[PDB]
Amino acid sequence: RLNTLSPAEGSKKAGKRLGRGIGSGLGKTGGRGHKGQKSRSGGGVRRGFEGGQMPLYRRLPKFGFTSRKAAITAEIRLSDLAKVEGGVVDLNTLKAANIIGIQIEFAKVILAGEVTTPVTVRGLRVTKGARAAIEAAGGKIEE
Amino acid sequence: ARVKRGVIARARHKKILKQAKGYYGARSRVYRVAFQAVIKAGQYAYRDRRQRKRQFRQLWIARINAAARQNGISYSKFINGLKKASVEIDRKILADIAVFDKVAFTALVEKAKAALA
Amino acid sequence: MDINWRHNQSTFYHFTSDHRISGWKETNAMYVALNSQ
Amino acid sequence: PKIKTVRGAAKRFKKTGKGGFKHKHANLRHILTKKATKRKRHLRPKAMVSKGDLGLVIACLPYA
Amino acid sequence: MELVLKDAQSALTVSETTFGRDFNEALVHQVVVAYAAGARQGTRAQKTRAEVTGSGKKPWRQKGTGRARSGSIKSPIWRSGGVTFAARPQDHSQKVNKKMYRGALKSILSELVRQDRLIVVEKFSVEAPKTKLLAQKLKDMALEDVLIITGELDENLFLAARNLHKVDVRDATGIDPVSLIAFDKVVMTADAVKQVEEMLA
RNA sequence: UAGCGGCGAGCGAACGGGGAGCAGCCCAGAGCCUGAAUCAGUGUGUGUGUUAGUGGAAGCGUCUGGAAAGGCGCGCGAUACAGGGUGACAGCCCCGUACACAAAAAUGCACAUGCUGUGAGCUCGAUGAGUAGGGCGGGACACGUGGUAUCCUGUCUGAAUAUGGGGGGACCAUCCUCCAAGGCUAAAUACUCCUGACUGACCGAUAGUGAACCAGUACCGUGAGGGAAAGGCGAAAAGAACCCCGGCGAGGGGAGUGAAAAAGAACCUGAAACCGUGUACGUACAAGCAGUGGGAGCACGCUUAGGCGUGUGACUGCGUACCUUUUGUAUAAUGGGUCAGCGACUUAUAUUCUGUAGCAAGGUUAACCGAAUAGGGGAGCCGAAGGGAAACCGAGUCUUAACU
């Protein structure tokens, strides 16, 4: 039955073929109008080009700096930490469970849903709401 | 997958040139002129499917106007008469009776003058 | 003959002469342009 | 290739929680003693990029 | 679910999730088109205007000949000139997700069971490595076009099916969608059925 | 990405992670001790490969046909139904293929072994000076001199030398790590003038090499250099004995071969433009995009006269080509002598949205290993949490001394 298999309905859309005839809809100018820079092969202006007006990304001031330290902090939910294999949570025990990453040095145990088992959190910062949620479902937080 | 395009191009050109038999000179030989001739014949054919209705109507009106003036009334007064006499014969048929049956047309003129008076 | 015809069509393809049209054809186009100014 | 970020746009817009972009207001770098404090106080918080301009910004910042 | 054996008249207990699910024709079609696309050695190249063996000398002066303006003898409009969008050798492989490949195999196995194109024998081996013996054996079982699949690849069976056109012997490891769909009947050894359920979970 | 950047256009890391592969050593130096591993150069022996090769299964009858491999009927081989040829399409006609073997000689690789050279190992000592660093100029580092570490050096200088020195991105201190100013080193890696085998949702003679053909030729140019066109009779030349016209021609007509010579070497098919011959109709008082609507007559076919079909088309209404560019073209604006062939929105990799398919608070692997489109491989990426410039906080957060 390889000549009876057939795709879904709506999955294979045709594909615009430009430049063929009058009936097709996209012939002569292929859908790109009359002359100009945009109807030209290769034609088009660059990104963030407003004619010559000073562009938006260049008439607005720049702010801030990049931390260096926010790239090594993480943010642990409570949906995990039932995933750590042990009921004890440090930076390793999270790295081992493929949940933070190897470069990570700091971690934090944000309330983002539903811890059940008694978990002993070690050496991680825990938010207020999630301290209450870990300690409410058995649990233990030392640091 | 290179596609040569000889056989299908030949078929399109030939289609157009068969639709142009009988045209004078290049209009029936050369594709590039027979294409324009065939299209312009298409536009005329459209336009003239409307004009044949206009042309036939003006022919019929001229024949009813002739035969009715032969019976002593104009076309204008004859059509008014038959509409007031509540006769609904269209004017293809009045032209055709006016050619083939002179006595029936005479009687139609009598209905028209009868109601028109 | 075909080789001589291709080369002898290729004769005035890289020309310079400005008073002669297409390198060779004599004209009055110097006076026409000059009078237009 | 892989699309290069318009790099001086990354220094100027920052992505928010529902896809909009924040930016610092213009007009607050120099000439300042001539300006009212009401202007300057209303130019300090950061602001969302308007509807017109998101097209441009999303084009310049394809990874943010 | 149970599979009635042909010869032993037993019933092999199988998973309903593997041998008794629905036919997802869209999924199977994606895995079939992708398998066939993975087979394309995409080896070809035409020459662009840059690679055609010529010179970059401009064939006539820009203005004054009455010829149309031309700049290269390797233009794609010129005879002998260089394909406009000349092809390069390309890779035609599609990614099939692993769960879509396994899903597709589960659908096609379920339809081979449902259309009675799946035969389960207890043992299927040939005496000597002769194509005559396998031809007679398949003749006795009313099978011409057949995919024998065995959990342990016999050497003699493999040599006996190598000349027969319609017949193909596989190990249970190396089955593909296009052969389960291609061949009219699939004859699985019971060991191959167990290995297939271990593969497809 | 961090960064560099008329902070424009753009350029663009490393750390760290996963894999492929994995190998360490020697001199600056004496003594003890010797040939101790080590390789290099050669001889010999063994194994294997290359350079010639050998064997290699299994079919006949009948019908169409010029011819059978085709149709129909009945058999046989297959570790061999890869492929090519044979008078049409052959597993069994031929060459081969699978499979099993073969080297007098010359060789490549790998072991073993003979000789030569080479040096193991132990104790103790030494442990690379116009050098590191500096000033000036320049360059390389992703880093454009900038707050710029680091490396290289054209010029001027100039240490300490294991109680020492280099680095850790200005710089100092503490701590950690390493030993420059001598050298050698396989594998993973890159490439194809050239050889062999195999493969292609590559091309099929205007394509594919420029070149299917005595092609880098003919030809062009002083020269460097540029650079063509041009394939196909037939199954087999059986390629046309002989006769006639003709100039002992060219070309032809017969004859003959052939299944077929409008398959005759100007050779398969044989289109179109273009040029003719023959027949039907129209056309020598009629003005123009040459058609179109109507339409008589005539000529051929019919047709149980059914009064239709085809060809022509007197006369008549209406009717100023196509393209392109334009506010607007019959325009006296552009383009096209015609035909035939080719000739223009692609490909790759990223990103976004829509459709669709899988799985779903999860989805998915990349390189690579590979029984190898399977399965492993979750390194990573994206999502489930935001706010803030940032520390930091977190369903909140920022602002602010604090926020109705």
Curated annotation (Swiss-Prot), chain A:
Entry-linked PROSITE patterns: RIBOSOMAL_L15
Signal peptide residue numbers: none
GO cellular component: cytoplasm; cytosolic large ribosomal subunit
Domain of life: Bacteria
GO molecular function: rRNA binding; structural constituent of ribosome
Biological processes annotated in GO: cytoplasmic translation
Compositional bias (Gly residues): 20-30
Segments for region (Disordered): 1-53
Alphabetized UniProt keyword annotations: Ribonucleoprotein, Ribosomal protein, RNA-binding, rRNA-binding
Function: This protein binds the 5S rRNA. It is required for the late stages of subunit assembly, and is essential for 5S rRNA assembly onto the ribosome.
Subunit-level organization: Part of the 50S ribosomal subunit. Contacts the 5S rRNA.
NCBIfam families hit by this protein: rplO_bact
Family: Belongs to the universal ribosomal protein uL15 family.
Protein name in UniProt: Large ribosomal subunit protein uL15
UniProtKB/Swiss-Prot annotation, chain B:
Highest taxon of source: Bacteria
InterPro entries in the record: Ribosomal_bL20 (IPR005813), RIBOSOMAL_L20_CS (IPR049946), Ribosomal_protein_bL20_C (IPR035566)
Coiled-coil annotated spans: none
One BP annotation, GO: ribosomal large subunit assembly
Keyword Ribonucleoprotein: yes
PROSITE patterns from the UniProt entry: RIBOSOMAL_L20 (PS00937)
Keywords attached to this entry: Ribonucleoprotein, Ribosomal protein, RNA-binding, rRNA-binding
Record's GO cellular component terms: cytoplasm; cytosol; cytosolic large ribosomal subunit
Pfam family, one: Ribosomal_L20
GO molecular function, one term: large ribosomal subunit rRNA binding
Subunit structure: Part of the 50S ribosomal subunit. Contacts L21.
UniProt function note: One of the primary rRNA binding proteins, it binds close to the 5'-end of the 23S rRNA. It is important during the early stages of 50S assembly.
Record family assignment: Belongs to the bacterial ribosomal protein bL20 family.
The protein's name: Large ribosomal subunit protein bL20
Organism of derivation: Escherichia coli (strain K12)
UniProtKB/Swiss-Prot annotation, chain D:
Pfam families recorded: Ribosomal_L35p
CC terms in the record's Gene Ontology section: cytoplasm; cytosolic large ribosomal subunit
One MF annotation (Gene Ontology) recorded for this entry: structural constituent of ribosome
Biased composition annotated in UniProt, kind: Basic residues: 9-21
Family annotation (NCBIfam families): rpmI_bact
HAMAP family recorded: Ribosomal_bL35 (MF_00514)
Similarity section: Belongs to the bacterial ribosomal protein bL35 family.
Protein name: Large ribosomal subunit protein bL35
Organism: Escherichia coli (strain K12)
Primary gene name: rpmI
Swiss-Prot record, chain E:
InterPro entries: Ribosomal_uL4, Ribosomal_uL4-like, Ribosomal_uL4_dom_sf
One GO cellular component term: large ribosomal subunit
Keywords, ordered alphabetically: Antibiotic resistance, Repressor, Ribonucleoprotein, Ribosomal protein, RNA-binding, rRNA-binding, Transcription, Transcription regulation, Transcription termination, Translation regulation
Gene Ontology biological-process annotations: cytoplasmic translation; DNA-templated transcription termination; negative regulation of cytoplasmic translation; negative regulation of DNA-templated transcription; negative regulation of translation; response to antibiotic; ribosome assembly; transcriptional attenuation
Anything else known: The erythromycin sensitive allele is dominant over the resistant allele.
Quaternary organization: Part of the 50S ribosomal subunit. In TnaC-stalled ribosomes forms part of the binding pocket for L-Trp with the leader peptide and uL22.
The name this protein goes by in its record: Large ribosomal subunit protein uL4
Gene source species: Escherichia coli (strain K12)
